[model samples]
Target: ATVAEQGEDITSKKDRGVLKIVKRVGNGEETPMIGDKVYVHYKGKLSNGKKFDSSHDRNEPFVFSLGKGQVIKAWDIGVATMKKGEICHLLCKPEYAYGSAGSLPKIPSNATLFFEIELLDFKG
Candidate 1:
């Protein structure tokens, strides 16, 4: 499936649903706050189950300053709900992700995204 133009088709979608987060692991205590640094391993994919990017594929984990607009809105909102050593799946709607202008050469326009995010550590 060419996820680049999967906007109008819903029956064939592999996405669990928008903003649906299934936490696999983590404690509610000591979650990240604003201006904190977070390190994670994640795999990004389209609703069609096509993988686009993955931090685990590389030797380095992804790092970003929390609540600093350093990443997508879905991440800022979802990651905040996670604690260190947490693993979760986040289904991001187009509104909370790359919307009108999706990340070119990878994500498609107005396409929904599925991500398996593992929060390694975060300094709140």
Candidate 2:
């Protein structure tokens, strides 16, 4: 996946009072299209900017078909807006992120996560 510095940062701005999309792939298209398998590289960090997981750091990219329940809910909705070769930042709220349960020491209950993603490819 290609990482570009041109992605927008929308977190500083406000939206709906809970979670805000820090950035979006393409022009903010809503929802993921069915049968769309996307290739991407991502970095997930906590609200405090602490790093947790990262495909970039691991030097491996992820490939998954949308609506397959293979990942978190935010990723399902977040990657929906992406186009091939686009990179975007996703600021996920707890509801859309790990929720109250979280993933243990790696994440806290109701913690927010920031993800920087690069869409490598897509297949319909």
Candidate 3:
């Protein structure tokens, strides 16, 4: 569950892709839309296995409007495709993440982040 378990590779090949998503659990019917507020619990780690962030640690679900750029581009793109209760591992290339300009402190430049995220709920 902590690792990027093997699942369906849902990356789009047509366009230049940076976010790699793999479904881990659930197949719920409802998926969030552009303006919907989605709630998720996630853990982010570097490729070297260093955990940088986790909503679970805060004991609160992270909420953001889908496709609204409230988070990283990879999150906007990946979480939009998930169904309620779905768990996924999102492999975000730097371009879809922080790019060459890394986030302060924990994140490094061009760091490829590995995130284990679960969709808890959403509302339009």
Output the number of the TM-score-best candidate: 3
Which 10 residues in a row give candidate 3 its minimum summed lDDT?
A: 1-10
Point out where model 2 deviates above 4 Å.
Answer: 1-32
Displacement of the residue 86 alpha carbon in candidate 1, Å: 0.8
Q: What is the Cα-based lDDT of residue 114 in candidate 2?
A: 77
Give the TM-score comparing model 2 with the true structure, all chains together.
Answer: 0.74
RMSD of each: 6.8, 6.3, 3.1
| Candidate 3 ranges beyond 4 A from true positions | 1-23
lDDT tens digits by residue: candidate 1, 1-124: 2222332222214452335444576765678998889999999888778998999777599999988889987788778777788887777788778998999979999978888889899875
TM-scores, one per candidate: 0.81, 0.74, 0.84
Report model 1's TM-score to 2 decimal places: 0.81
Indicate the residue-level lDDT of 1 in model 3.
Answer: 24
lDDT of 1 at 86: 87
Clashes of 1: 0
Tens-digit lDDT track of model 3 for 33-78: 9999999999999988899999988789999999889999879988
Q: CA lDDT of 108 in candidate 1?
A: 90
